Short mmCIF file of C-alpha atoms and ligand atoms in Angstrom, two decimals:
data_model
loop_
_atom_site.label_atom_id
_atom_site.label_comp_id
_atom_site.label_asym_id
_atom_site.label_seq_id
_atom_site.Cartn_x
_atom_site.Cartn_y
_atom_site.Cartn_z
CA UNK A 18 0.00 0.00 0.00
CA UNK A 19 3.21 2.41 -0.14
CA UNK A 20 1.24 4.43 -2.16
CA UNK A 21 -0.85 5.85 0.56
CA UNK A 22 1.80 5.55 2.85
CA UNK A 23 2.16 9.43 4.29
CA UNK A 24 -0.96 10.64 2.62
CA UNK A 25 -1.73 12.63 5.80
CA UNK A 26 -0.84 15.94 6.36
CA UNK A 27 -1.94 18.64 8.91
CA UNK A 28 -0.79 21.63 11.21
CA UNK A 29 -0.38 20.89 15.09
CA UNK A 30 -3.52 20.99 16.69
CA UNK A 31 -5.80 21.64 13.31
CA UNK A 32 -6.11 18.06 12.53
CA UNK A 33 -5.59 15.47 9.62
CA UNK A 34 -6.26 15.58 6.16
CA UNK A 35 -6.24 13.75 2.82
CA UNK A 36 -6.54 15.13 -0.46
CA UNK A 37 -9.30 14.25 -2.08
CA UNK A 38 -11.16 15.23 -5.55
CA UNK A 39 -15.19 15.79 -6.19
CA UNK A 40 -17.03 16.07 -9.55
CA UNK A 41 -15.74 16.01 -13.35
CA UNK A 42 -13.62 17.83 -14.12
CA UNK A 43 -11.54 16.78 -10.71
CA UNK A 44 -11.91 19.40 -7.64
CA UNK A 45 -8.88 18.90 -5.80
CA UNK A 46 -9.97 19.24 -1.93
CA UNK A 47 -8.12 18.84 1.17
CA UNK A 48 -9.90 17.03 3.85
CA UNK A 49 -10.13 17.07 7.47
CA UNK A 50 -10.19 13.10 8.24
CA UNK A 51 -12.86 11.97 11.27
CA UNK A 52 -13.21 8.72 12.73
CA UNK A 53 -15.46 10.44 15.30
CA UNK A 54 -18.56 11.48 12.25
CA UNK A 55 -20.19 10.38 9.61
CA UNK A 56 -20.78 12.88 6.92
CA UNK A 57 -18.99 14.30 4.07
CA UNK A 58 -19.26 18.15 3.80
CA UNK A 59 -17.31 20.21 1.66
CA UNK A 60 -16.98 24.21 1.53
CA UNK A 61 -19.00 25.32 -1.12
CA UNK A 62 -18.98 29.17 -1.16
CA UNK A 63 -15.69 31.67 -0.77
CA UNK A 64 -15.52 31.33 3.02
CA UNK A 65 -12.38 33.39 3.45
CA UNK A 66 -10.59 31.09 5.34
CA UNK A 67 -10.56 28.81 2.82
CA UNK A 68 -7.79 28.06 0.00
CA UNK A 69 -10.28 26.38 -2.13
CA UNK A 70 -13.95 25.17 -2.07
CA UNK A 71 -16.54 23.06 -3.81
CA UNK A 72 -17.77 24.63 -7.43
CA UNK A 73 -20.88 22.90 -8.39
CA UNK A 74 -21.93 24.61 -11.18
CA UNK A 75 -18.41 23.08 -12.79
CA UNK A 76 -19.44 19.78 -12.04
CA UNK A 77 -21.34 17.25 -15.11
CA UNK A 78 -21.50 14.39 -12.66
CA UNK A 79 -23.05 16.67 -10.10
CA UNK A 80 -26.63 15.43 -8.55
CA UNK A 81 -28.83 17.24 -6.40
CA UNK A 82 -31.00 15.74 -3.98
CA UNK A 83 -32.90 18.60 -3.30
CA UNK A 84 -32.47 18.68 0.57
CA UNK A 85 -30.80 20.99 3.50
CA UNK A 86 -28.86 19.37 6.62
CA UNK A 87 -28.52 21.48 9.76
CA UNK A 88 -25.38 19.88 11.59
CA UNK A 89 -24.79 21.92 15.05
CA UNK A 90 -22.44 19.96 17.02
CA UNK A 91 -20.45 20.89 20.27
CA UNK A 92 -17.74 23.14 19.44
CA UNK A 93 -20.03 24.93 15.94
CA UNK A 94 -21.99 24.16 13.70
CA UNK A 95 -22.40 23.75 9.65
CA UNK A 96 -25.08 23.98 7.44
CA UNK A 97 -25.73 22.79 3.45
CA UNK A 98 -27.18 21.45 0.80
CA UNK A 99 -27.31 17.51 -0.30
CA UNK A 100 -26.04 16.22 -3.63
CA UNK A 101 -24.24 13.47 -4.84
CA UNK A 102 -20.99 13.84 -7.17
CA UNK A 103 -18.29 11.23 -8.25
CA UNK A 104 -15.30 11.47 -5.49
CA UNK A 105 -11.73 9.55 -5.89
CA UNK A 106 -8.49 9.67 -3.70
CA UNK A 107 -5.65 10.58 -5.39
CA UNK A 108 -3.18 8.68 -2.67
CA UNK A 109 -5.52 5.97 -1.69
CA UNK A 110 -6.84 3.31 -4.08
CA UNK A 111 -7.49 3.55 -7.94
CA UNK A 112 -11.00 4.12 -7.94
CA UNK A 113 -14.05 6.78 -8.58
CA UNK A 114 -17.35 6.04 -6.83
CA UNK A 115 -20.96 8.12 -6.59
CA UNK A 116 -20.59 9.85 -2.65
CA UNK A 117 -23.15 12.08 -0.70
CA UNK A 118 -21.83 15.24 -0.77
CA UNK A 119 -22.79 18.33 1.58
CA UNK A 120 -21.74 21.28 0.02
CA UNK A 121 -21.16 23.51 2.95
CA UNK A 122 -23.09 26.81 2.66
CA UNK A 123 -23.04 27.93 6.12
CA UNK A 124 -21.18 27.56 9.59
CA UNK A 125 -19.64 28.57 12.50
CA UNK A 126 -16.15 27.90 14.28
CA UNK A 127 -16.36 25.06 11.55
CA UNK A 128 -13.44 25.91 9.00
CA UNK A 129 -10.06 26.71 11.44
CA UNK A 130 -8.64 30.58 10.03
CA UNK A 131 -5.34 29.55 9.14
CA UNK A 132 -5.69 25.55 8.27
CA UNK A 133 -5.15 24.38 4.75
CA UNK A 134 -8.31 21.98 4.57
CA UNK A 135 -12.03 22.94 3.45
CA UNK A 136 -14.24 20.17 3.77
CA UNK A 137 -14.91 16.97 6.64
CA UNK A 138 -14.39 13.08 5.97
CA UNK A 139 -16.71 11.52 8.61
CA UNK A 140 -14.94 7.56 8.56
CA UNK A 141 -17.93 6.58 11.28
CA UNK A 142 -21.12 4.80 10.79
CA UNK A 143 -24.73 5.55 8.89
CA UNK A 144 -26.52 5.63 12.37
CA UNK A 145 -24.56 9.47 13.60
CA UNK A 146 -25.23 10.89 9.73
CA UNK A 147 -27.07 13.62 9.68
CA UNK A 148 -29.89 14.43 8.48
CA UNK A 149 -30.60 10.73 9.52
CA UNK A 150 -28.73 7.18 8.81
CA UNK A 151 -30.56 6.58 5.36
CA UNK A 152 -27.38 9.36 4.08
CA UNK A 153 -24.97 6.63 2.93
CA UNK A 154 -21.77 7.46 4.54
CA UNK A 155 -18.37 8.02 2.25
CA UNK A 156 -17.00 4.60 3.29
CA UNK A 157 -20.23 2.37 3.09
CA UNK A 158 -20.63 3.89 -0.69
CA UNK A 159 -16.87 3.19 -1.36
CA UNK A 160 -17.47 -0.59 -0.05
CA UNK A 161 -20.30 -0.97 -1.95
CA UNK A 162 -19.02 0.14 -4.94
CA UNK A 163 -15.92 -1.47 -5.25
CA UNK A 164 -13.73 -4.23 -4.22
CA UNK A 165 -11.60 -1.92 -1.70
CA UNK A 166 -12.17 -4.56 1.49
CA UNK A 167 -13.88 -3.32 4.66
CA UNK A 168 -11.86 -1.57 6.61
CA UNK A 169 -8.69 1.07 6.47
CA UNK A 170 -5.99 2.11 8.95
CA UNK A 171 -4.53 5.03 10.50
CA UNK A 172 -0.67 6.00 11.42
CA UNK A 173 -1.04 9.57 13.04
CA UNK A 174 2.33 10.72 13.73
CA UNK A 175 2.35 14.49 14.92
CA UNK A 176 5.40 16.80 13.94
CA UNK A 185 5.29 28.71 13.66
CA UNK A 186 3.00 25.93 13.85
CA UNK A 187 4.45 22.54 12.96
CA UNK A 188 3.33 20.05 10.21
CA UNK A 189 2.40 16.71 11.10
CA UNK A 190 2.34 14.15 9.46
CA UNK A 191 0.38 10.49 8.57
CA UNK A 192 -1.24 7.47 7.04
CA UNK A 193 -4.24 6.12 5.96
CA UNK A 194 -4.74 3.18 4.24
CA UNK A 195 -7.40 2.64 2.53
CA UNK A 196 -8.54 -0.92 2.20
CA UNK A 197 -6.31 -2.69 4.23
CA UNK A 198 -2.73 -2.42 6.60
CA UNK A 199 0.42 -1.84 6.12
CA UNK A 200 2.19 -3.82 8.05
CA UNK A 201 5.77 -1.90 8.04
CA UNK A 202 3.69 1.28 10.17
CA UNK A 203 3.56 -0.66 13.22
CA UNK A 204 5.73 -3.05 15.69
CA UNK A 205 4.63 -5.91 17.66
CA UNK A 206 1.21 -7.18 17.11
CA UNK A 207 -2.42 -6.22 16.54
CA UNK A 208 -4.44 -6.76 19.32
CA UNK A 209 -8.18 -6.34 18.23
CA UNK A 210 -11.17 -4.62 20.94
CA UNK A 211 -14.25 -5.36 20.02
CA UNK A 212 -16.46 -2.21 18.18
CA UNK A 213 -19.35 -2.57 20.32
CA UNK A 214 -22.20 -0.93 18.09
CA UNK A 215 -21.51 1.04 14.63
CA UNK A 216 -22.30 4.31 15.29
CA UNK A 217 -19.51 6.10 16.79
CA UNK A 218 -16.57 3.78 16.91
CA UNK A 219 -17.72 2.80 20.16
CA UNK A 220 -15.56 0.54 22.22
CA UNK A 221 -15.41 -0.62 26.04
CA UNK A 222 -12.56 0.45 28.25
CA UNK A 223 -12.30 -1.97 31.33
CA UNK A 224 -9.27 -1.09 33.64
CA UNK A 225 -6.97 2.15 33.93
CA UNK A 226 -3.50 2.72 35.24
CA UNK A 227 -1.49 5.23 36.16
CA UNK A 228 2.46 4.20 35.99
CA UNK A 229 1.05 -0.13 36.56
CA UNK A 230 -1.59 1.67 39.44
CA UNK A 231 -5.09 0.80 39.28
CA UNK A 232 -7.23 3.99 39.74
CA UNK A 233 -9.63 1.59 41.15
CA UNK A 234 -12.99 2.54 39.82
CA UNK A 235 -16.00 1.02 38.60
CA UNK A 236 -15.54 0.50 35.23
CA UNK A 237 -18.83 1.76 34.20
CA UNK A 238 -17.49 5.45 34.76
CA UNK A 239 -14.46 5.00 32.06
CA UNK A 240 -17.11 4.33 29.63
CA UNK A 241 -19.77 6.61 31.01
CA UNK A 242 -21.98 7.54 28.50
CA UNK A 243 -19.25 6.20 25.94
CA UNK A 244 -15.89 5.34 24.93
CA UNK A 245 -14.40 6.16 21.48
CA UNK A 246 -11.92 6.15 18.92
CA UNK A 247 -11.56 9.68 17.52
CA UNK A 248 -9.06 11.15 15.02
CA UNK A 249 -10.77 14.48 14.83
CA UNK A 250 -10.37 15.25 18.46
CA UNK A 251 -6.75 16.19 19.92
CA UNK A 252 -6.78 15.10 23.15
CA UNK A 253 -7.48 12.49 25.49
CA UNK A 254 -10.55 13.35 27.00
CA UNK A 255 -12.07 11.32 30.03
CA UNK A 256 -15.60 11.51 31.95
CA UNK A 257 -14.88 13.99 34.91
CA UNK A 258 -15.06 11.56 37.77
CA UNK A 259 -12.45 9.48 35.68
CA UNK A 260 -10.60 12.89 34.70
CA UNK A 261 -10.21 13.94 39.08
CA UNK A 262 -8.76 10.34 40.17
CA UNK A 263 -6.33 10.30 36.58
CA UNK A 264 -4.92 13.61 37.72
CA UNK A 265 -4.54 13.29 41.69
CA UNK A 266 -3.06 9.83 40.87
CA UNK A 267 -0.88 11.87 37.91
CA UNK A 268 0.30 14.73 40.35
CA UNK A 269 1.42 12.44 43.17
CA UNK A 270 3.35 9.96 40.45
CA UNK A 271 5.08 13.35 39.48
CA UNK A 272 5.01 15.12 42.64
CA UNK A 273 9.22 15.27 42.17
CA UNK A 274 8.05 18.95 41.01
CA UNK A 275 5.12 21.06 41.66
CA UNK A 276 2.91 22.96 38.86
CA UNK A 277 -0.53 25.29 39.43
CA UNK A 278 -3.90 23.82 39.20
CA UNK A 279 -5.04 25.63 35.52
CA UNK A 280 -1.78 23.43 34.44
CA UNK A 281 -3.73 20.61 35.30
CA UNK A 282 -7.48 22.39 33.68
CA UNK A 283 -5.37 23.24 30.44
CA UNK A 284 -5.41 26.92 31.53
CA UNK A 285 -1.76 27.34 31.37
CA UNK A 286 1.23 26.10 30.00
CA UNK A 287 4.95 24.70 32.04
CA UNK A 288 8.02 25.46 30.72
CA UNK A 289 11.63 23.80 31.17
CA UNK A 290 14.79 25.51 29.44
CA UNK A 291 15.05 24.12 25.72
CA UNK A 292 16.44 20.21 25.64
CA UNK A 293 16.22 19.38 28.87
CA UNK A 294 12.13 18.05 29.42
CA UNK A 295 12.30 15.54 32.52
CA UNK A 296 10.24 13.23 30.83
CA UNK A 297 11.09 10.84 33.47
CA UNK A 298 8.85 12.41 36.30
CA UNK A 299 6.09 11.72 34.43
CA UNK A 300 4.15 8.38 34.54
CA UNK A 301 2.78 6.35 31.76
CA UNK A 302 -1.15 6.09 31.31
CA UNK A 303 -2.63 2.62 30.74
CA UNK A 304 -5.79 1.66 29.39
CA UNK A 305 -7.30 -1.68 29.21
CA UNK A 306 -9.51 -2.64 26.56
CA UNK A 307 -12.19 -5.21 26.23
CA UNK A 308 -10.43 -8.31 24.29
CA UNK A 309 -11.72 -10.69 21.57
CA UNK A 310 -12.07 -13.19 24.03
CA UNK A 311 -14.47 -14.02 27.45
CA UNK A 312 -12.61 -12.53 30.45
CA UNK A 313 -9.98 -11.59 28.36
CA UNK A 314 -8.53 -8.36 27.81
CA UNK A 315 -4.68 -6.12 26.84
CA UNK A 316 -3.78 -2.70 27.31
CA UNK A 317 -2.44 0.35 25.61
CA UNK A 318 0.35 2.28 26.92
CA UNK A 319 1.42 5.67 26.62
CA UNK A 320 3.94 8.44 27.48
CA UNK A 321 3.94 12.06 28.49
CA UNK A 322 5.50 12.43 25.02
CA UNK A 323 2.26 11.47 23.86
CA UNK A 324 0.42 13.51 26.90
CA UNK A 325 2.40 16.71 27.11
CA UNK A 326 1.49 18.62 24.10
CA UNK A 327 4.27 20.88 22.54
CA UNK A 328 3.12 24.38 22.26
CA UNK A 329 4.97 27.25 20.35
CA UNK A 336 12.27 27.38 26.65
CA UNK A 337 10.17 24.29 25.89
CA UNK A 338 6.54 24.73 26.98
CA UNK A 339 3.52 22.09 26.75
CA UNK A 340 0.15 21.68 27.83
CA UNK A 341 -1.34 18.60 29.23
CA UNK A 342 -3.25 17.41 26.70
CA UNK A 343 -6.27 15.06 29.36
CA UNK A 344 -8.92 16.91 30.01
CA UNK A 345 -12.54 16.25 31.10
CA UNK A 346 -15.67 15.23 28.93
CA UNK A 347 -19.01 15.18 29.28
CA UNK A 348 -19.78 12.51 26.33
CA UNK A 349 -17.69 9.90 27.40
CA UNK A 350 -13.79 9.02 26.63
CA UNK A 351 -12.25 9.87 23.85
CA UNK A 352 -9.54 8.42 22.37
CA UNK A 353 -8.33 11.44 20.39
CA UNK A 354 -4.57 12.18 18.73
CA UNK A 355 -3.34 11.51 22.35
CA UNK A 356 -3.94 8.20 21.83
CA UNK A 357 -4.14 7.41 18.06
CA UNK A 358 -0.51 9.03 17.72
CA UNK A 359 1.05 6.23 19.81
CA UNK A 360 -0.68 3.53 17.72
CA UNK A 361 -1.45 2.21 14.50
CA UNK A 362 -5.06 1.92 14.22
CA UNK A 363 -6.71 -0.62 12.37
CA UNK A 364 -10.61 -0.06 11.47
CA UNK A 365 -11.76 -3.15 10.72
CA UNK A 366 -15.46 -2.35 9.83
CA UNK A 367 -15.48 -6.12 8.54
CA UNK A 368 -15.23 -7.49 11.64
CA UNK A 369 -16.57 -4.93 14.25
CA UNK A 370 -13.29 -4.34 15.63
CA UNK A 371 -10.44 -2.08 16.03
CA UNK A 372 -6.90 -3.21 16.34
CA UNK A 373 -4.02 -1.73 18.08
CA UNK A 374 -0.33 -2.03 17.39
CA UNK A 375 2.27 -0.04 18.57
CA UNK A 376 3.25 2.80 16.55
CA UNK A 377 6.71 2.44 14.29
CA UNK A 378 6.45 6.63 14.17
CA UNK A 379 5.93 7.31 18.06
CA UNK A 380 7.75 9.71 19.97
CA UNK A 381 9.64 8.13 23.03
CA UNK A 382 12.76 8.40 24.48
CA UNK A 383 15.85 5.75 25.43
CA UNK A 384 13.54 4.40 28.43
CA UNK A 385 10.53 4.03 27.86
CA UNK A 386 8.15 3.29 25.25
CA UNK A 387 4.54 3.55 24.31
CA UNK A 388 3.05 -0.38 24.54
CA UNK A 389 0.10 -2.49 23.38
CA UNK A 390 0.15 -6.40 25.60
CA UNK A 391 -1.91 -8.64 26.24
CA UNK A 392 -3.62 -11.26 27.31
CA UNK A 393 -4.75 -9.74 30.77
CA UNK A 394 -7.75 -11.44 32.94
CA UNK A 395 -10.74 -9.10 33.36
CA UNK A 396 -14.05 -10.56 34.77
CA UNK A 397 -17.14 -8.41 33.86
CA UNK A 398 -15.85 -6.76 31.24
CA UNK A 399 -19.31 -6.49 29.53
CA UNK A 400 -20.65 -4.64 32.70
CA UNK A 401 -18.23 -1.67 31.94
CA UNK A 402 -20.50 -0.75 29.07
CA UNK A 403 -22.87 2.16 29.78
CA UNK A 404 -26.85 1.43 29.12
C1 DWB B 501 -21.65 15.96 14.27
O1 DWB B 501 -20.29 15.85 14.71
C2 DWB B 501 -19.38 16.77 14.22
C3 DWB B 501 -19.70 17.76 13.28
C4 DWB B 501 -18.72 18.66 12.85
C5 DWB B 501 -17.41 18.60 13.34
C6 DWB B 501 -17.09 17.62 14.29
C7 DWB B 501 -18.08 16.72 14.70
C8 DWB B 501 -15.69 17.49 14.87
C9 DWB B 501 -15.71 17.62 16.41
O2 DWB B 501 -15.26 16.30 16.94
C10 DWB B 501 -15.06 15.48 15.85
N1 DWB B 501 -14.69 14.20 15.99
N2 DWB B 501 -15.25 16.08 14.67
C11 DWB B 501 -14.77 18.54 14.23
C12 DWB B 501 -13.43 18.58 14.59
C13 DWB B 501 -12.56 19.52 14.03
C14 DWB B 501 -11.22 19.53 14.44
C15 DWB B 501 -10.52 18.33 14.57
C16 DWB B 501 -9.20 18.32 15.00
CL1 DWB B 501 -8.34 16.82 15.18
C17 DWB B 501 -8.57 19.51 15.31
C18 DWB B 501 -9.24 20.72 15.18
C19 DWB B 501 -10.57 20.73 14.76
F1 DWB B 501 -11.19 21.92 14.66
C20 DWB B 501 -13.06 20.42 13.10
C21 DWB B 501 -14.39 20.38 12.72
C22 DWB B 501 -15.25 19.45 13.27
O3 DWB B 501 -16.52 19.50 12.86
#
């Protein structure tokens, strides 16, 4: 697949996107790539924050279907109109297929001023599509269409503002963007790519919790949110449990809320007083479960004397397993067979140490009671 191999591109903090093309003649577009919706929306009018944007009117294969969506989320909102239009990947596999398209023709805090993409791949399932799940998602039409297997993959490998870098592959795994192996947690319904945490540790220390409130109302795998966010009764014991593992030296409590940065003279970061973050996921098998593993490197968020932010911080819609996360793992979607996989990442930052882990097998009882109803 070294053909989609670093077909990722973004500026710290902005995201991930591919470059795609819409209609005939070809619209080159760069898009923002989301594991965490389910619609594909493209700027359509001269926004000025955008480079480029979706012409219509120079499109033959161009369809309309006649119908607004209303998308507030969060964070914004957009707003459009439905159509369909033939869409290809330039860097992912040799094909043209018949998508949805939203052409974007209204929004708010939705386009970044300063980012070089203008439009949203939503990678996640029919049932979170808006205006409701009978708008075919990108992915289910490419499936459909095609002989591109069931599933694709994500390396996310970070970095005024820095470019990072990445991969998706489209249709399968690459097998060089990882160490180690796979180890598979179940998806445990296709709307989000929902999945079931079931034990987490700070440096090997349990924080001791039900397990219902790491999944509390969900858990999920997210590559259009930055950092790891946790419910806030999970978010308080990860962070008392954080501060006395580091205690060696002392920072203010908006450190801790993200409402200030720390600083250490340039080259000399003591990663070391920091502790890794474990979490356990639900296995493949009864009672069986592994865990992921990650550093401050992946934690403590660069920001431009070297100064970061910490990148946890609390949620009110569950975990989620944002760029924190992803960016110490290859990810494997594998729609196919309602699973993700994890493998550690061959592009992680870490130091002489330590470094960021995926084992298994671990014994967890219950694990199906750590699911939120
Ligand atoms: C209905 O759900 C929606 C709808 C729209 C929507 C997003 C979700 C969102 C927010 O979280 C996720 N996963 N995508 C989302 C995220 C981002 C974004 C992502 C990253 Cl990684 C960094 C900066 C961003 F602004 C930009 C736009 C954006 O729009």
């Amino acid at each position: 697949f070294v053909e989609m191999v670093d077909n990722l591109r973004g500026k710290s903090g902005q995201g991930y996107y591919v470059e795609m093309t819409v209609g005939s003649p070809p619209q080159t577009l760069n898009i923002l790539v989301d594991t965490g919706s389910s619609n594909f929306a493209v700027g359509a009018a001269p926004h000025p924050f955008l480079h480029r944007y979706y012409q219509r009117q120079l499109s033959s294969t161009y369809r309309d279907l006649r119908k607004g969506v209303y998308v507030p989320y969060t964070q914004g909102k957009w707003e459009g109109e439905l159509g369909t239009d033939l869409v290809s990947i330039p860097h992912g596999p040799n094909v043209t297929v018949r998508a949805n398209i939203a052409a974007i023709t209204e929004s708010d805090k939705f386009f970044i001023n300063g980012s070089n993409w203008e439009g949203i791949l939503g990678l996640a399932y029919a049932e979170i599509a808006r205006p409701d799940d009978s708008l075919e998602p990108f992915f289910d039409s490419l499936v459909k269409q095609t002989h591109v297997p069931n599933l694709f993959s994500l390396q996310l490998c970070g970095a005024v503002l820095a470019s990072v870098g990445g991969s998706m592959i489209i249709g399968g795994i690459d097998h060089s963007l990882y160490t180690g192996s796979l180890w598979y947690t179940p998806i445990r319904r296709e709307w989000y790519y929902e999945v079931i945490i079931v034990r987490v540790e700070i440096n090997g220390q349990d924080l001791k919790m039900d397990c219902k409130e790491y999944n509390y109302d969900k858990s999920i795998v997210d590559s259009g949110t930055t950092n790891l966010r946790l419910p806030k009764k999970v978010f308080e014991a990860a962070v008392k449990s954080i501060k006395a593992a580091s205690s060696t030296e002392k920072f203010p409590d908006g450190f801790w809320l993200g409402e200030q940065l720390v600083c250490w003279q340039a080259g000399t970061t003591p990663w070391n007083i920091f502790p890794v973050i474990s979490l356990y996921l639900m296995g493949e098998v009864t009672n069986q479960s592994f865990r992921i593993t990650i550093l401050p490197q992946q934690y403590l968020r660069p920001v431009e004397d070297d100064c970061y932010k910490f990148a946890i911080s609390q949620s009110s819609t569950g975990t989620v397993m944002g760029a924190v996360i992803m960016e110490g793992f290859y990810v494997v979607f594998d729609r196919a067979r309602k699973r993700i996989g994890f493998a550690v990442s061959a592009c992680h930052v870490h130091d002489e140490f330590r470094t960021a882990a995926v084992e298994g097998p671990f014994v967890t009882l219950d694990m199906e009671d750590c699911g939120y109803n």
